């Protein structure tokens, strides 16, 4: 389906920053393993993929304090 929108991107970026994680180091690698495509940039996800990643980041951010 269609590419990730800027509101979803900004929600993901907010959570990455809160978690002390990055696209390059953390999330792009994980998305590539989970979705089994080769994802090399944050704008290259689909909206459906991004929503799945955002749900996972919310769980992480809700679970515990960042050390």
């Amino acid at each position: 389906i269609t590419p990730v929108n800027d509101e979803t991107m900004q929600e993901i970026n907010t959570l990455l920053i809160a978690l002390d994680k990055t696209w390059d180091d953390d999330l792009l690698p994980l998305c590539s393993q989970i979705f089994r495509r080769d994802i090399r940039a944050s704008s290259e996800l689909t909206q459906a993929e991004a929503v799945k990643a955002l749900g996972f980041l919310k769980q992480k951010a809700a679970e515990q304090k960042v050390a």
Partner: peptide, 10 residues
């Protein structure tokens, strides 16, 4: 296949 619904470390 691991999934975003799984208790994946991050």
């Amino acid at each position: 296949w691991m999934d975003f619904d799984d208790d994946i470390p991050f």
